[PDB]
Design a protein around this ligand. Structure first.
Ligand SMILES: Cc1cc2nc3c(=O)[nH]c(=O)nc-3n(C[C@H](O)[C@H](O)[C@H](O)COP(=O)(O)OP(=O)(O)OC[C@H]3O[C@@H](n4cnc5c(N)ncnc54)[C@H](O)[C@@H]3O)c2cc1C
Ligand SMILES: Cc1cc2nc3c(=O)[nH]c(=O)nc-3n(C[C@H](O)[C@H](O)[C@H](O)COP(=O)(O)OP(=O)(O)OC[C@H]3O[C@@H](n4cnc5c(N)ncnc54)[C@H](O)[C@@H]3O)c2cc1C
Ligand SMILES: NC(=O)C1=CN([C@@H]2O[C@H](COP(=O)(O)OP(=O)(O)OC[C@H]3O[C@@H](n4cnc5c(N)ncnc54)[C@H](O)[C@@H]3O)[C@@H](O)[C@H]2O)C=CC1
Ligand SMILES: NC(=O)C1=CN([C@@H]2O[C@H](COP(=O)(O)OP(=O)(O)OC[C@H]3O[C@@H](n4cnc5c(N)ncnc54)[C@H](O)[C@@H]3O)[C@@H](O)[C@H]2O)C=CC1
Lengths: 473, 473
């Protein structure tokens, strides 16, 4: 009876980080994973490494370099005679990076002493974990603690079931072997905007159909308004308030029927991406007498420390409440492992940053202006546009702004929101300050290197209290 | 004859920021500047905006985009048939950026009520400032406070005097209208490396002659070693321990004689850049009875508040001690203006970041490993290479590392050093943490967005105490 201090089900950002940290803390750790990768063998890394964060960013980076060479080289004096993109080669570089990184997780497991099991894990009664191998044979592990990290999968919609290579979800959208001439996207969330951007940059004519009237409702309204304008200018035909009701595939095209403010509409595409959210994965995960309970939406019910209804059983990442993000999952894995080891590790769910990897990049941490207004919190706001940044001018990349929101009474920074170059790095600067309880004046008093994009955060913080140097307060 | 609360001599990063801040604080402020820019009008912004920070970064950004297109596009599937660079067009883009930014300072002066004088300012006795206009008219301003911000100029050396357009300093090197076939550079400091990189990327064969045996002695030794390796890969023939002894111009070429470990050498170039430091400018600045004194090296003598030997007379920026950097000058300008207004403002000279705008970028804040060893401070060091960064792999830019140095007894972060993508933004994250007295464990406990280059700083901080997740410890 193989006994472990910790058995982790799933090897995505939540599970594989939890497993490594547990091993670092001296806990005898096992990690169970079932996903078969491109080589026909089990591949670690979950959604983020295999069909998620890293593959998307690889294609975003390649497609942006092509786009800049095609549309933004002449101002530098650079003449490029006939620039082209080989989509199979672009996708192959992405696939090679995925291969390398997933293999790297297995190397980390070996270096840290994590025992890997290949197959489907199911929690039985009494913290026993049944592993069904690829050959259908089972093995039962005895666990002192179980960490459930089974992740999520794309939401499906009746009008647009996945079909051949014509209707795809995010996984298929990362595998096109040619630029789709006309590309439809259902959902103007982060996946729809990122993957729509990839293919628009390479020449696709993209329409994004979004059910809600409000664009990027979790973002600060000023940021979202600028994002909608800029992304529309880049060729993302974002249609808000569009209710998709049907589709039809014929002649290797897909016609989508939807209702908007002006009635019933139809639009035809060569490919259709369905990007309407993700849902937690619990299929065959829990024995009927396991004791673990689910909430109304199918997530595993946990407390603020990711502990389930069963002592010694925890659940982390996309399968539990909170932002469905990779750094959220990994930090929960660290917390759970450290608490199993006896440390009072806690998580601040208030300072988890968000990033949308469009270009311009969008990122934020903390609260939006509209949220604080709804809460009745009086605030001071400071903004600085990249159009006034010398570094951004040198970069030929002046779209966007930095926004800092501070409490009007205490001057404590309550949110930092950026659309523009290096948005994620500037928001991380703001997040570090907020971890220490920074005021806007604190940020203003620091020495920021010149010329850097970081100066825009410095100026925005000074603008909170009306004495930015480089804008007319 | 005309009375002001504050008279500022010079409109570079020190002076123009001091003037704006003084005006914001309600002080009747004048700013004197003599520099005529490219449009034939007085141009504010000093060295940094006109012939320094901003023009260099514009040419660095343009030349990098050309270089990437030539050498690093095919892996993405991008084929560029015959990429070329029009040097006049590249320089014209830079000139236009300079025009727009310098005009922007004048707009800020007008919006804040700063009175501009065109001409040369000279401090007389009793805080009177004589202004000799470019039109030869003289007038005396009666100042309650004077801020001297006269800046610096390139060091000159007898073996390599500036000559026509063949032997130039940094100003001339930003104005080449064609790529020199063979380019010589005296000095492997930040200017030599940055401007050498520009022209190497566009096809010049670049040789850098450095008198010292040690490369980038102010940088962390590990960072400097990596920098030398990558710059060698990029085509910079950096010759250490090379003492230039003579030069000769003939037939539109220059032959340089120098001594190295193997004796006397000669090398011929089409152009020669002399980049061997900068010296403070005090020419005709101080009347003999002004009361302001100079130190042995020609800098104006000031205390830690930038106050001279004369009450109410201050000196800031490159003309006084400390790092000759634009953000140092501007922060001193803010301090001095706030102190004139009655605030007990102070300057923190310990957390001024340094950036070298090569690609990969080099940046650091705080102390190097070798400095701390010389001081007898026991430290723990953590490093993380960008070769292990998923974000950097997606970007096709995996050279370099992040290094965090912490006190072994308190775990307080004492230095952060980066060579690689977004080095300056990552160092600014470290600097913000250090302003708040962060430990390495503090940084390790924060949530960093994934996938971002910032994660390399998070992992390096975790590595300090031996529990980075994504590299062996
Ligand atoms: C295109 C796309 C792009 C994204 N980009 C980003 C981004 O840029 N930044 C960000 O923060 N987030 C991003 N995300 C979200 C991110 O991928 C998820 O938040 C993250 O992967 C969640 O980690 P997890 O460990 O909870 O789940 P997962 O990554 O899904 O891993 C769950 C693992 O558990 C396995 N598994 C499930 N059930 C079992 C079982 N019974 N037995 C054995 N194994 C099982 C699965 O095979 C899987 O490997 C993106 C997602 C998508 C789809
Ligand atoms: C090629 C080059 C690249 C550089 N890149 C960077 C970088 O990337 N980052 C960074 O931080 N630093 C950089 N620097 C250094 C930076 O330019 C200086 O540190 C900064 O300009 C100093 O500001 P200052 O106000 O003290 O002096 P200055 O910028 O030199 O301004 C002094 C002003 O005073 C005027 N003046 C002088 N005497 C008088 C007088 N009697 N009366 C009226 N006017 C007078 C001058 O015309 C001048 O405009 C670079 C420098 C060079 C040469
Ligand atoms: N940069 C990052 O952090 C990334 C993280 N993710 C995360 O993965 C998860 C899934 O991403 P998304 O699919 O984009 O979910 P999402 O919630 O971000 O966006 C889904 C959008 O589709 C809309 N929607 C739902 N049903 C619809 C319907 N019939 N018709 C039209 N629109 C409909 C929704 O209003 C929403 O705007 C999210 O939690 C996301 O945060 C995914 C990609 C990148
Ligand atoms: N990214 C940034 O912050 C930049 C700031 N600057 C600042 O401008 C000032 C001057 O820049 P640099 O000219 O590069 O000075 P520097 O001090 O950075 O380097 C000058 C180098 O030339 C060497 N030297 C001196 N005499 C020599 C001789 N005969 N022969 C060969 N080498 C000799 C020195 O050892 C030194 O390495 C510096 O203070 C610099 O920080 C300038 C450019 C960019």
């Amino acid at each position: 009876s193989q006994k472990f201090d910790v058995v982790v089900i799933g090897a995505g950002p939540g599970g594989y980080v939890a497993a490594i940290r547990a091993a670092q803390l001296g806990l005898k750790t096992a990690c169970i994973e079932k996903y078969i990768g491109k080589e026909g063998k089990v591949a670690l890394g979950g959604t983020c490494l295999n069909v998620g964060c890293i593959p998307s960013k690889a294609l975003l980076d390649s497609s942006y370099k092509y786009h800049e060479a095609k549309e933004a080289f002449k101002v530098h004096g650079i003449e490029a005679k006939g620039v082209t993109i080989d989509v199979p080669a672009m996708v192959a570089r992405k696939a090679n990076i995925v291969k390398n990184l997933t293999g790297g997780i297995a190397t980390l497991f070996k270096a840290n002493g994590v025992t890997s099991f290949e197959g489907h894990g199911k929690l039985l009664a009494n913290k026993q974990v049944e592993v069904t191998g690829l050959d259908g044979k089972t093995q039962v592990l005895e666990a002192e603690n179980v960490i459930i990290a089974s992740g999520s999968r794309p939401v499906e919609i009746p009008p647009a079931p996945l079909t051949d290579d014509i209707i795809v979800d995010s996984t298929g959208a990362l595998e096109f072997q040619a630029v789709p001439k006309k590309l439809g996207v259902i959902g103007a969330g982060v996946i729809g905007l990122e993957l729509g951007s990839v293919w628009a940059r390479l020449g696709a004519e993209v329409t994004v159909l979004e059910a809600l009237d409000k664009f990027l409702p979790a973002a600060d309204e000023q940021i979202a308004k600028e994002a909608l304008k800029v992304l529309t200018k880049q060729g993302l035909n974002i249609r808000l308030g569009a209710r998709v009701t049907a589709s039809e595939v014929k002649k290797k095209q897909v016609t989508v029927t939807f209702t908007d403010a002006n009635g019933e509409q139809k639009e035809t595409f060569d490919k259709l991406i369905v990007a309407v959210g993700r849902r937690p994965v619990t299929t065959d995960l829990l024995a009927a007498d396991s004791g673990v309970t689910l909430d109304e939406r199918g997530f595993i019910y946990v407390d603020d420390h990711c502990k389930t209804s069963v002592p010694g059983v925890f659940a982390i990442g996309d399968v539990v409440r909170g932002a469905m993000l990779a750094h959220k999952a990994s930090e929960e894995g660290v917390m759970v492992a450290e608490r199993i080891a006896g440390h009072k590790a806690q998580m601040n769910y208030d300072l988890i940053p968000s990033v949308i990897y469009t270009h311009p990049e969008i990122a934020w941490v903390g609260k939006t202006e509209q949220t604080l207004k709804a809460e009745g919190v009086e605030v001071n706001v400071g903004t600085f546009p990249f159009a006034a940044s010398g570094r951004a001018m040198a970069a030929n990349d002046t779209t966007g702004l930095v926004k800092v929101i501070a409490d009007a009474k205490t001057d404590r920074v309550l949110g930092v929101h950026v659309i523009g170059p290096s948005a994620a790095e500037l928001v991380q600067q703001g997040a570090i300050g907020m971890e220490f309880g920074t005021s806007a004046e604190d940020l203003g008093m620091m020495v920021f290197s010149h010329p850097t994009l970081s100066e825009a955060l410095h100026e925005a913080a000074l603008a909170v209290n009306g004495h930015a140097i480089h804008i007319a307060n």
